[PDB]
Structures are given as C-alpha cells and as structure tokens.
C-alpha cells in the first residue's frame, strides 16, 4: 500500500527528536540513558527512534503486578503497573519437515518434546485425540510467560512537558497493556524504554501492524 510509505514519511518528517535531550532521571531508580536508533527504513533516513532506556531488577517479583516508577525530567512522574506474566497458548502441528514420509515420520518425537517442555515450564499440556500425522495439530500447551521488555509511551501535554500516554500503554503494536515482549522463564531484569508518542517506531508499528514491513 503506497499510502503507507507516504504516511510513514510524513510522520518521520514531523518528528522532533530534541525534547528527549532533556530526558534524564530514573526508572525504578536506575539512571536512564537516551539512545538514538536508526529504524533502517530504506529511503527514509530520518526514521530514527529516540528513547530513554533502563534495565531494571525484577528479582523481587512474586506476583503478576510489576510496578514501574518513571521519574524523568520534563516527564510528569508516573507509576505504571505492567503485567509481569501472561498465559501463552501454543500448539504442535505435524509438518512436512518433521514428517519426511508416512513411514518415516518424526512428529511423535517432536510432540513428546513439546509436551516435556510444556510440563517443565509449569504448563498444561493437552494431547489432541487421534494419531499425530501430517498436517494435524497434535497437542497444545498453555503456559505462563514472563515480561522481558516494556516500551512505555509519554505524550506532549504542553511545550517541553510530557505525561504518561493513557492510550498507548506500549510502543509495540497493538499498543495495549499486554503488547509487551513476554518469554518463557522468569527473568532477573526487564528492559524498560520510554518513547514519545510521536516516535517513528510507533508510527512504523502502527502503519505496519507490528510487522515493520512497508
């Protein structure tokens, strides 16, 4: 869609990265650092993100409610409750690469491996009734996954003044409370970023629905 490329260019063209130069301070007491990262969008050289970043401890976490206290100059202080864990549902489907022929099929092996990893994660494994052969879904796993990266968003309230964006909970599409990076296993730290709502990364995420293509 050629309108997408133009809409992205316009968003980049209008992005002023200089207010973030005033961003200093802490996230959960960890001093932030501001980074400039090229989005490497061809033909759009100004497509450069500018965000604050802090790697913060989560070794106190026992619950699902991770609290993130943002104390950055020119940003109104706010405390975000972020979901520390969520349920991931996956399935194992018997594919051609795992099933060279009907007589030499390895799908049962990889189903058993899927089951064992599910169980070792504390998940619920359910075997699908019927034989596990080509192009069938053979099992599901419902397991808990844990936050790795939290990209918060602030918006301009007045000139050179920012506040927590109550609409964009995350800079990652689809920008909601659970649109963060979750992975199996309990981490020791979480990487927290702070983006302006005008950041080209968010424009890119929005126009490509998180795919970052076009």
Numbering used by the authors: 41 to 254
Pull verbatim passages from the article behind this deposition.
TcSMP is a poorly characterized protein, reported to be involved in mammalian cell invasion, with an auxiliary role to gp82, the major adhesion protein of metacyclic trypomastigotes. To date, the function of TcSMP remains to be elucidated; however, knock-out studies carried out on a homologous antigen (43.7% sequence identity) from T. brucei (procyclic-specific surface antigen-2; TbPSSA) underlined the importance of the protein for parasite transmission.
Overall, the electron density map was of good quality, covering residues from 41 to 254 with no gaps. Overall, the structure was found to be composed of 12 β-strands and 5 short α-helices with an elongated strand (β9) that stretches from lobe 2 across to lobe 1. The larger lobe, lobe 1, comprised residues from both the amino and carboxy termini, and hosted most of the secondary structural elements of the protein. Lobe 2 comprised β-strands β7, β8, and β11 and the elongated connector β9 strand, plus helices α3 and α4. Strands β7, β8, and β9 formed an antiparallel β-sheet. As determined by the secondary structure matching (SSM) program in Coot, superposition with the T. brucei antigen revealed a high degree of structural similarity (RMSD of 1.9 Å over 162 aligned Cα atoms), with large differences only in the lobe 2 region, whereas structural alignment with the antigen from T. congolense resulted in an overall higher RMSD value (3.3 Å) with major deviations in lobe 2 and helices α1 and α5 of lobe 1. Two separate, sequential linear epitopes (Ep1: residues 130 to 156; Ep2: residues 163 to 182) were predicted and located to lobe 2.
